Amino acid sequence: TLIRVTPEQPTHAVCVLGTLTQLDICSSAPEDCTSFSINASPGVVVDISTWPLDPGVEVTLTMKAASGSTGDQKVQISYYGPKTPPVKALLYLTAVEISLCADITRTGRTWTWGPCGQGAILLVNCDRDNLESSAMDCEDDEVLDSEDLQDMSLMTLSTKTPKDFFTNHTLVLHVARSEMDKVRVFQACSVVLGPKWPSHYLMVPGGKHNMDFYVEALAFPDTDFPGLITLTISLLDTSNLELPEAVVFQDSVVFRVAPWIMTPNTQPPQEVYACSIFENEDFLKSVTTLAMKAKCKLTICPEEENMDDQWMQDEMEIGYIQAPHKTLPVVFDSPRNRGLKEFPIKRVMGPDFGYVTRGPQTGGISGLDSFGNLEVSPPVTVRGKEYPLGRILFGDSCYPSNDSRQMHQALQDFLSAQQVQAPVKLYSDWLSVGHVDEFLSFVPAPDRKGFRLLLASPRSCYKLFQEQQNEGHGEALLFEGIKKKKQQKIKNILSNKTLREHNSFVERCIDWNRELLKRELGLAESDIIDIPQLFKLKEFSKAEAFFPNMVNMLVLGKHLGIPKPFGPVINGRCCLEEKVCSLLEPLGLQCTFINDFFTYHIRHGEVHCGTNVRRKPFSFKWWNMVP
Amino acid sequence: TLIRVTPEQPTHAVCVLGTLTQLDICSSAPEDCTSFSINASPGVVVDISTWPLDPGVEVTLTMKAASGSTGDQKVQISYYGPKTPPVKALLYLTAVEISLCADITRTGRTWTWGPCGQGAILLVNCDRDNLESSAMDCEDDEVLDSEDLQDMSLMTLSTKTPKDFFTNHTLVLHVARSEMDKVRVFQACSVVLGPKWPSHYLMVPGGKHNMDFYVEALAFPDTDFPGLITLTISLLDTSNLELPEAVVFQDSVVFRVAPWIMTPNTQPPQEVYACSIFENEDFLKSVTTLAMKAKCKLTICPEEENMDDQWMQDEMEIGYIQAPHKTLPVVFDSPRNRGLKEFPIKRVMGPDFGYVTRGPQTGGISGLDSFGNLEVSPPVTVRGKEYPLGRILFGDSCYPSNDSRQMHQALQDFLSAQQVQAPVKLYSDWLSVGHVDEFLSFVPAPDRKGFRLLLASPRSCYKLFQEQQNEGHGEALLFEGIKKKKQQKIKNILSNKTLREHNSFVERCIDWNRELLKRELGLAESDIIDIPQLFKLKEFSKAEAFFPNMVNMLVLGKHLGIPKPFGPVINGRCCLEEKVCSLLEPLGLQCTFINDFFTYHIRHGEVHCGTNVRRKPFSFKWWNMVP
């Protein structure tokens, strides 16, 4: 600020520490005068030992400490000229501390990304530490549990002033009306800013005081919300009862709202999910053993909640949110809204488990909206550009027509607004169900980049079956093990022209994603592995699985839950099974084959489709990313 | 793409020029085999003279020219091993040109800012070259005038193929459904993409062909539109009548939609605007002469269109939009919607004059929504960071309360979405009317940075009147010239305690913007000039002008149209007038003083409030900015 001094009259002013204060000396300097001196109380440091009256040369004032009383530091400007006796202009200053503080170093003036960057973190309080209610913590105007505070971002106001200072001044706290629907703040425990209140007079005393606030966000980043929240503190002069308050000081702190981040298959599993239904028991024991082998909690949805809905992968996706002071997992509930509609609301969402949802809840959606169509890559680097939490992957058509499908725009928008997993659209529309879980998986790897990508591959199967026919097993029966289905011999399959045509075309759709995924994830052929897999086209020439779709597997660490192909039996073992094993076991992967044939496959899915996994969040802090 | 070759069968493929084509040789390589050779037609260049069968070493294919006929370049892979006689795998390729082209160099794969950057430009076609209609060109699905094409962005498709190539292939053009409401495209002249149509099969022939498209945008950048539009061309294989089309190629071009940019007072005026009303004639001659002096076209609104509304500055603001191929001015019509409601629609908007509007048209607005509260700085550099078109400036309160006002959020959002003039909010709410035109102006300057900032300044006036009282004119009468108003002597004014209080407080509100503007525009005191100006607080302690508000002037180049203060007369001239002149004329500025006293001032405005100016757009191209 610029303080204008006068021989006319003594001047009074406030001075916030850490602010630059300056002096206009010339404007009102009396005449007969060429020169000036500054003299000052020891509390005041003065920068530019006597000087000419030149309006271009600058005087600057910093106070070392807070004042004990109004006016208690003094400055004196002596004007003098040759003929003339000294004329003095007096200045009385009061020094104060006003520190609005938040964890801007991320350890427990603007927001910037990276290890060197600055800006506080703030979490959407979308869990339900309240044991009673149905609602998210953030929807009411109260802290109901102490527990609830652990989610919230702490901010403190530190003042030091003279003891009578709030006779003449008042502090306000505020946030833009633009942003009051996306924040709430509690004084310590009652509310002071929120969607209803954009500003508040703080009731503060002179001397030393500290005032803690707790902050919760009410909205994730989206198309209309970049994810920044500013809170400002203003200091007002209210000395004059006739005039309005005039601003003396403002200071700010910037929160960034934590994005929703997903976990790839190569993050250590923590909890597995499935559905118990009629005649699915042998399925669930295989899973239960597989869960147990990887030390995962195991959560099942019984038929009375199911409502026939066996596809636990599809209603939801378990991401997380992360702050220096708290991390917690958060369910992206899919608007698909089938029988499993309530599983995310009733029994997943809870204390230290968040909830979010997007898109139209009644109608208006498609198969691509299911979260079998939503996956994440593991960390990659693409031509030098790092993606330390991977890149979200989701299915689309190659172009829009009246026959095409897409994932709702509100979802695509949400996922891009989280920024840090930089979504990549894939071409999955060619499938009947149209989910990228139907031709890709990833699995941990002890070497290279620590994963391999898995792709469904007819080519691989045509080869495998050709290699047998060659060595004398042209008669071997696919579907051995299933009575109540017509077995087909390798010789017949290979010589089926229509089938070959179908799978050629599926190869094209697939290859197109291989190159796509090679580009956007920076992969090399050595990072990829092909699984022998046969499809067939059906209603509307859309692609289905010929035999169980092995790449639709469950990845619990090194324990893979693969769909049992029931391939042709050679040397007392199914040869597909053996072919996967020869490809996976070299990498430390233990392949269980789970019969899902009459339970899942004939209903158009497999093991991955039947289940879901909460996995451990990345150690890497998303804010040290530079997206 | 990866082409898989076979001794089993000869392979057929298409190859788009400028794309990388690669060969999978091992996967289907017959046995007895260690080694291979590639032989190829002269059109094919092949990179890696015989080689071992190692799946990790890469073969790459580039075609030099387009094919004259299907299959007419050939490749031959010879597999061989010690015992074994050569087995050949044959490959037939067809080379094609597919070039979707646009002015990405900005002279007439992604979008990037700056002189070194790349990306085509696209203009919102918000003018009305159609002489008949009321509507903006962009609202219907037709080009109605050849003239209209001059606004649109040209894009061309260049193909070279064999003559029968579109027996088996078809080209599609498309845009995301996300963006089809914000674009339209015309083939040359009929529509093919727009809000109704997201994709189109192009009807193309083999051999050489060129196809021009013309593109218009329907939306400026906003909170929900960053301002990018992608159009994609896909090539489809339709060889198989039984199977769906499978993608073979996609290519894209990125347009950025041109922002709406405002012009500061130091851009050469082109056209002046005002209102003829009852008893305002002497006002308009002063303007008409001043307009004439600066060679400006002069546009007046007669009372029958006015509807009493004399404030021509306030309904609108004349910005422009700019592309390599066309620039045209564009009216930001303010939602204030008073008597002047139709001036922007009926008589400004036209051929080569655009229109845009934002915010609620019926109700819901305030004084800060008027465009007396919307200005732009001239170009500055702030701590190294360039703002080559200035920084928009607009009035706000210091914090939100129930008594405060702001400019509607939809406007603030719009102005920020244009990015290139990086809006800066100021504190103007303290005024009755609350417009930044009421304490700031800018004027050209022959030196320093080529402008000076003007600020209203009571301090300056108190000094001026004190300097007179001192030299014997304490009796001199403010308001000499106005009978029908009570004159006040300098001596009385100076000794009025309440008035001094009011103006102290206004000094605070003002100084707070001085520092604000010093920071965000990087100004030094030497860039600023103070105008003596007195205010008084009135209803709700809101600030008004004591005498006509001189800084509320019209800037037509070096010709300034200043409000006549009617200051105290000393030496046959008003001393305020003389004080401005001593401050402005040193810089080449010619100060006319225009009596607006009973016409404008007593109705709460002055000369700048009565008028408006279209000014010449910056030469600097906004896209070479790096915001």
Ligand SMILES: *CC(=N)NCCC[C@H](NC(=O)c1cccc2c1C(=O)N=C2)c1nc2ccccc2[nH]1
């Ligand atoms: C693998 C994956 N992520 N998705 C599997 C979902 C397959 C769903 N199948 C059925 O619901 C189904 C199909 C055929 C017969 C039956 C059933 C069933 O549940 N009971 C008999 C599925 N989900 C969708 C959603 C939209 C379109 C088609 C779908 N198929």
Ligand SMILES: *CC(=N)NCCC[C@H](NC(=O)c1cccc2c1C(=O)N=C2)c1nc2ccccc2[nH]1
């Ligand atoms: C300088 C500038 N950019 N704005 C000037 C607008 C002043 C407007 N004044 C009047 O409309 C007005 C006030 C008092 C008496 C009269 C009039 C008038 O036109 N006829 C008699 C103005 N515009 C607004 C808008 C909102 C609140 C107050 C306003 N005052």
Ligand SMILES: [Ca+2]
């Ligand atoms: Ca709560």
Ligand SMILES: [Ca+2]
């Ligand atoms: Ca909570």
Ligand SMILES: [Ca+2]
């Ligand atoms: Ca749901």
Ligand SMILES: [Ca+2]
């Ligand atoms: Ca919690």
Ligand SMILES: [Ca+2]
């Ligand atoms: Ca998923």
Ligand SMILES: [Ca+2]
């Ligand atoms: Ca038109």
Ligand SMILES: [Ca+2]
């Ligand atoms: Ca036009």
Ligand SMILES: [Ca+2]
């Ligand atoms: Ca209007």
Ligand SMILES: [Ca+2]
């Ligand atoms: Ca035009």
Ligand SMILES: [Ca+2]
């Ligand atoms: Ca304006």
